[PDB]
């Protein structure tokens, strides 16, 4: 029903990371918020009425000389957290279920720098892409590594996975869709502006794009239909689709965060920030959305 589309977003919560934040994640149970910085991960708790907090519940640093963190990802079940960065010899998995925060197994990525994180929980697989233009798949169960998807140095800035298909996009203004079950070349779709973000609809098979010129497009998996609904006055580098499949939110260099409704691409009232917004995520509970901009993060409440 149309009632699923929200109406109002409000927030009274502020997190002071202390340095510019590059990724965010939120637990489905709506209990904790995770922010990734340039040198360490910090874990925070929502169970409080504090307006702004400067102290995390824990600080998880990396100690390799010349290390550099870039991204973090949380799986759906709110169990395992993945991390990766620059000048690191391995990727890490962190477990939340144990009474104290302890690290888990690691897999190597020496000689490469990664900016991509996606995980197929039920199949126990993880996905990452590297600046060289390669995508590799890791197994979270038996720690085996088998994958080689490369060929294009560009076009691998964003990753979205749906079953046995992986969608990629980058600065070449081109969109590609891969098949995990085949050793053949992918299928190309050509656009006229740089792609900066991707998000997939969980209910119907549609993929949402964000373009560098402020335009928004919908691509259908049937390979023929294409739509164009939305316009912003600057670059967009963040799109996120709600788990119910009815609405999405978009952020970009315009520093404006707004809510859109499928399929007319109509605007729901928006909330303005003060600086470019580069991080956005929505909980599997379909009640909270968290953002990352500058040295701060925020937690928003969704009203239906």
């Amino acid at each position: 029903k149309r009632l699923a589309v929200p109406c109002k977003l409000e927030k009274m919560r502020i997190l002071a990371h202390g340095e510019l934040v590059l990724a965010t994640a939120i637990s489905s149970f709506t209990r904790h918020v995770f922010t990734c910085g340039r040198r360490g991960i910090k874990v925070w708790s929502l169970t409080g009425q504090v307006a702004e907090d400067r102290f995390p519940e824990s600080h998880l640093p990396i100690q390799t000389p010349g290390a550099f963190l870039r991204t973090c990802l949380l799986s759906s079940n709110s169990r395992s957290l993945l991390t990766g960065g620059y000048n690191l010899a391995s990727v890490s998995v962190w477990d939340l279920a144990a009474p104290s925060l302890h690290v888990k197994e690691q897999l190597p990525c020496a000689g490469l720098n990664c900016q991509a994180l996606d995980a197929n929980l039920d199949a126990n697989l993880a996905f990452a892409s590297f600046t060289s233009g390669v995508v590799r798949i890791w197994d979270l169960r038996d720690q085996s590594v088998v994958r080689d998807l490369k060929g294009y140095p560009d076009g691998v800035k964003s990753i979205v996975v749906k079953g046995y298909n992986i969608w990629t996009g980058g600065p070449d203004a081109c969109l590609r869709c891969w098949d995990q079950r085949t050793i053949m070349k992918p299928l190309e779709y050509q656009f006229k502006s740089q792609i900066m973000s991707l998000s997939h609809s969980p209910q119907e098979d549609w993929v949402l794009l964000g373009m560098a010129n402020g335009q928004q497009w919908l691509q259908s998996t049937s390979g023929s239909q294409r739509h164009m609904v939305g316009q912003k006055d600057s670059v967009i580098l963040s799109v996120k689709f709600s788990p119910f499949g009815q609405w999405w939110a978009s952020v970009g260099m315009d520093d404006f965060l707004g809510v859109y409704s499928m399929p007319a691409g109509t605007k729901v009232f928006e909330v303005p920030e003060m600086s470019p917004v580069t991080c956005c995520d929505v909980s599997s509970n379909n009640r909270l959305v968290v953002t990352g901009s500058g040295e701060h993060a925020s937690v928003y409440q969704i009203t239906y």
Binding site: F29, R31, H32, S45, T47, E57, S58, L96, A97, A98, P99, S100, L101
Partner: protein, 92 residues
Amino acid sequence: IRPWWFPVQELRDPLVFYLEAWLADELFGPDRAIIPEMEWTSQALLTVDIVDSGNLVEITVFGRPRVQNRVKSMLLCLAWFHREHRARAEKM
């Protein structure tokens, strides 16, 4: 030892209910190893001990009262299933 994901505040005012010792060994096992997994999945803190001459076990549940009730009800339903199965087996 309080788990890191459990807030210290929720420790206050726990819920306490009693059960039978054999029921406790059927539910949680003789080694009580399954307690942490149920604690996580239920999001509450549990204590199991035998307090009445080896006959009656006391269980304490920490957390928000609704979670306490949910855990208590699940445990009571499992104990009732065990009671029914044991009565049916003994009558057989």
